[PDB]
């Protein structure tokens, strides 16, 4: 609001002060004859400031003006030694401009003068922000190794630019090459960068984490850089032996999984909302990982756990339908004619025939709630709240049973209300076991995509309509009988009744023995037109949600839900029944890591 | 599970023992100077085993290492004479590796040494399995004639490789060339293989069946190899005479049909689930066969049989609606107020007016059931069970009538229940006569595609929803009156009632004279949202089932159902009314087979 508009202010003030002190104006157009006229007999003072603390050398480098800066290096060889003093432009020497603008003659002249290749241009513009247009680190070597100027890249090593370098965010240049969409050339440059860290490795430069602890090979799967991920894969791809079209190939599998422990590339994939990060699973040393990890013992241990949940709900369900119910004991229908009721038992002890069996059955159900809340608090508190899905329901289903337990031994009336919420949530929570079922799996996702996405953009469009016609009909039938044609007696009944007409489930107000008021004959006629078109416009809106999403976009989501389930079962379930996949370096001393072998065909 | 994971174990053990005994390690990298250092003064023992019983000659052939094996043939010319002794690799000599890896210098050197060209590499890897990646028979000639090395193919005949050869599955190489997707070159090779069986034919090599009795021309229609099928067609394509664009052409038609007898290419097409095998009917000596066989006397004998089934059902239907019914004889409504009833006749004999006519009409219907079960037991027992369709119903419709006959002369009460199942199955079983009707034919298939395919993936999604809300409403209306607002009195009524709201057929619970409990006002409001969206998501799921299937994919299925009906009518109906198509070699002595003439145009 007030900030990015202020960024325009110095930009004009940069160009306002270029009219003042016209040696900058000569530096704009590389007008060196005026630069003779302002320095060859004027002499001493040239250290001119500006908007971002910029210099005449900075401006004469800001455009590709070699000949003016050729004078300026001869005139003032200390403008190199000073950076930009600003907040938006902090630490940027003229080298960073000369690097980023491909001026090979000037950079080589600046390095002939001698410029700090380790300078950190830490201006607030240069921070890794989604509103800033670019981000290329701190050091000019990072600015060298992002624009394609491999000659400067070779030249900066000749003047000692450390490949081992960190930005504000703990990244090397290797992380930053992931962070550009212009990936058509940096893979060629990716080979160039590792060529100049061939001497002193000490971890061979790939095991650098960032500020938050992320190696670049793990970062590229997070960032979804597919092409970088493949040339990265060449390091760890150990071919066993070829056989015509058959290529028996082994993978190192060091960090693609790590079996829990919060730093695992499979765990790092399904945490983000980035759509491009999902397609890392299309790669053959990853899809073969998740297939064998799920088909061998990921699917059946899921489906066995699928069965025990159903027997939990039915045990819950039968104990709900057999509640103890006193007949009436509240005297009669003392509120007139709308007060049908039947009481419940308060504190009469549980009798033995078919009722302690109801009691021990609830004791099956009450321990099933608390075991969830002991195992799902490391599913929420692990990641703050950030849970936006079906784990929202299993904690909510567990809440309602405890409320029913609170209604036990206190004997308040409102126990049916959490029990009614428990059943619709308990039976809808076995939708989560439609993930790993091939016959109806991808249909399950198209439900939940329209829950938070499409229902939410329609409930406002229903509430804008239902609030009129229910209120309209209430004015009409305010002066009527609730006995005959009593399709609402009061106002909030009319909202629920009009809902029962807008969704076209109930016939509606029609009593032919009497005369309806004619405004009902008009408004409801106008209502049903709107109801039958807002219904179809929604179904139209469903079509645009699926014509695009059937184009091989819903299948991969179902594959993703296989993995995200499999990751949690790998994470939450103990190491007595979940063995480590792959084959380690014990009994085959090759690299000590768990190895996976993939055999392929070429056609 | 435990098996394919074990396949990785020897592969490492193959590469574990290559570090041990480093003459294998020299053979890996073709390091012959070490092979001088381990044989030229060591001498005697070189017969080294390994994982799959492999040799040093096997490993030095496993990579294209000519010069090491050049020493090895000079050093140990008995490694050729031994194969691999393993289970996974049984009978594989080094020739099979040298053949499959295009090493023309080495194979010619091995055959100069002299290797068995008739060796059968019968390892369990090499079996025709869908989990194994390749399958090229037993003999190296089969390995020669699949990879494109026609020079070795010519070379193996020079050392006497029999074209007349059988694998474990009774196949020659001609069957195996069908079994590769890489068909871009083997048709050229298909001419090459028949060139070297030009001398001694005795059936000219094409009439070889497999282990189960399948000739390759019949196999290619089964395997759906379209391109092989066309060059196969050239053998039997006898051109009569051309006329400008008109090309009068005759086909041999020997085995494309065989009129019953369980070995018939038309019968062999519509038995499989292979989608590619359906497109063999697109070929012009096949589509012209089925058109004339169905239009001349396949369609009208179907439609005449269509009419007799309808008169069977209506004769069944009128005899059902005229059951003999005693008035009440069970005394009154002794169970209170929900026991309306009317009795049936037990053993009072059939009176003559309009009732023996009912009796002889059932005698029309009871003989119609048993004639089906005498003619459909060679439709099930012929093929085990394997019936997954409409022949499932005609055996089930026949069952219910026999149960009704069992209810006759025993006078049990539950006769309405098989009779009610009989009517809905009897009237839906005349959907089978919508196959051969052009105006609504392809619409009939889109029904049955969604029965076992799309209904089944939705009934779980209904049962997951209906089990909550019916059980939810039952808790609500457990403490209520079944007299007023009695939309279920007990629990299983609520399941059928909520079904009668989820499909949005009945208005629902609404009694305005009383006060509904407010949790009904919330849950049913939440229910109808879910009901009106799960309905639309299903209709969304219908759209992805037909946007792809309208793209010229439903029409050919309707053509397939024409043929599969026509094949059964050719098979099940006798040779007095179903004459053999084509024209035999009697009165035109050409080849004795039934000949079909096709005239075509070129544009």
UniProtKB/Swiss-Prot annotation, chains A, B:
Posttranslational mods: Glycosylated. Phosphorylation at Tyr-135 and Tyr-136 by SRC leads to an increased calcium influx through the channel. Probably dephosphorylated at these sites by PTPN1.
Ranges where the record places region Interaction with calmodulin: 67-77
Result after altering residue 135 to F: Prevents up-regulation of the channel by phosphorylation
Segments passing through the bilayer: 301-321, 359-381, 389-408, 415-434, 455-477, 522-542
Parts of the chain on the Cytoplasmic side: 1-300, 435-454
The keyword Amino-acid biosynthesis is assigned to this record: no
ATP-binding found in the keyword field: no
GO molecular function: calcium channel activity; calcium-activated cation channel activity; calmodulin binding; identical protein binding; metal ion binding
Expressed in which tissues: Expressed in duodenum, proximal jejunum, cecum, and colon.
Location, primary (coarse class): membrane
Segments in the Extracellular topological domain: 322-358, 409-414, 478-490, 511-521
Residue ranges, annotated region (Interaction with S100A10): 563-567
Gene Ontology biological-process annotations: calcium ion homeostasis; calcium ion import; calcium ion import across plasma membrane; calcium ion transmembrane transport; calcium ion transport; parathyroid hormone secretion; protein homotetramerization; response to calcium ion
Sequence ranges of the ANK repeats: 18-48, 52-81, 90-119, 136-165, 169-210, 212-241
Intramembrane features from the record: 491-510
Known function: Calcium selective cation channel that mediates Ca(2+) uptake in various tissues, including the intestine. Important for normal Ca(2+) ion homeostasis in the body, including bone and skin. The channel is activated by low internal calcium level, probably including intracellular calcium store depletion, and the current exhibits an inward rectification. Inactivation includes both a rapid Ca(2+)-dependent and a slower Ca(2+)-calmodulin-dependent mechanism; the latter may be regulated by phosphorylation. In vitro, is slowly inhibited by Mg(2+) in a voltage-independent manner.
Name of the protein in question: Transient receptor potential cation channel subfamily V member 6
Whole-protein residues included: 67 to 677 of 767
């Amino acid at each position: 609001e007030s900030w990015a508009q202020s960024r325009d202010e110095q930009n004009l003030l940069q160009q306002k002060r270029i009219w003042e002190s016209p040696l900058l104006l000569a530096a704009k157009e590389n007008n060196v004859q005026a630069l003779y006229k302002l320095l060859k007999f004027e002499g001493c003072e040239v250290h001119q400031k500006g908007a971002m603390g910029e210099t005449a050398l900075h401006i004469a480098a800001l455009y590709d003006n070699n000949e003016a800066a050729q004078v300026l290096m001869e005139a003032a060889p200390e403008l190199v030694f000073e950076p930009m003093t600003s907040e938006l432009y902090e630490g940027q020497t003229a080298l960073h401009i000369a690097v980023i603008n491909q001026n090979v003659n000037l950079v080589r002249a600046l390095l002939a003068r001698g410029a700090s290749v380790s300078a950190r241009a830490t201006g607030s513009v240069f921070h890794y922000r989604p509103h800033n247009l670019i981000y290329y680190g701190e050091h000019p070597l990072s600015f060298a190794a992002c624009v394609g100027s491999e000659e400067i890249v070779r030249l900066l090593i000749e003047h000692g630019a450390d490949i081992r370098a960190q930005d504000s965010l703990g990244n090397t240049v290797l992380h930053i090459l992931i962070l550009q969409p212009n990936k058509t050339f940096a893979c060629q440059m990716y080979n160039l960068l590792l060529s100049y860290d061939g001497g002193d490795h000490l971890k061979s430069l790939e095991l650098v984490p960032n500020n938050q602890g992320l190696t670049p090979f793990k970062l590229a799967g997070v960032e979804g850089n597919i092409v970088m991920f493949q040339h990265l894969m060449q390091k760890r791809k150990h071919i066993q032996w070829t056989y015509g079209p058959l290529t028996s190939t082994l993978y190192d599998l060091t960090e693609i999984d790590s079996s829990g422990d919060d730093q695992s590339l499979l765990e790092l994939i399904v945490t983000t909302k980035k759509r491009e990060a999902r397609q890392i699973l299309d790669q053959t040393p990853v899809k073969e990982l998740v297939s064998l990890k799920w088909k061998r013992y990921g699917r059946p241990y899921f489906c066995v756990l699928g069965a025990i949940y159903v027997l939990y709900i039915i045990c819950f369900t039968m104990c709900c339908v057999y509640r103890p119910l006193k007949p009436r004991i509240t005297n009669r229908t003392n509120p007139r004619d709308n007060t049908l009721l039947q009481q419940k038992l308060l504190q009469e002890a549980y009798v033995t025939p078919k009722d302690d069996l109801r009691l021990v059955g609830e004791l099956v159900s009450i321990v099933g709630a608390v075991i969830i809340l002991l195992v799902e608090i490391p599913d929420i508190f692990r990641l703050g709240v950030t849970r936006f899905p079906f784990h929202v329901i299993i904690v909510t289903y567990a809440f309602m049973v405890l409320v029913t337990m609170v209604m036990r031994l206190t004997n308040s009336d409102g126990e049916v209300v959490p029990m009614s919420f428990a059943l619709v949530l308990g039976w809808c929570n076995v939708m989560y076991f439609a993930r790993g079922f091939q016959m109806l799996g991808p249909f399950t996702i198209m439900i939940q995509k329209m829950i938070f996405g499409d229902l939410m953009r329609f409930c406002w469009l229903m509430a804008v309509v239902i609030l009129g016609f229910a209120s309209a009909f209430y004015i009409i039938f305010q002066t009527e009988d609730p006995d005959e044609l009593g399709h609402f007696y009061d106002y909030p009944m009319a909202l629920f009744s009009t809902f029962e007409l807008f969704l076209t489930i109930i016939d509606g107000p029609a009593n032919y023995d009497v005369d309806l008021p004619f405004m009902y004959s008009i408004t409801y006629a106008a209502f049903a037109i709107i109801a039958t078109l807002l219904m179809l416009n929604l179904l139209i809106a469903m079509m645009g949600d699926t014509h695009w999403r059937v184009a091989h976009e819903r299948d991969e989501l179902w594959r993703a839900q296989v993995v995200a389930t499999t990751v949690m079962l790998e994470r939450k379930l103990p190491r007595c029944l979940w063995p480590r996949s792959g084959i380690c370096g014990r009994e085959y001393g090759l690299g000590d890591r768990w190895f996976l072998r993939v055999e392929d065909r070429q056609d």
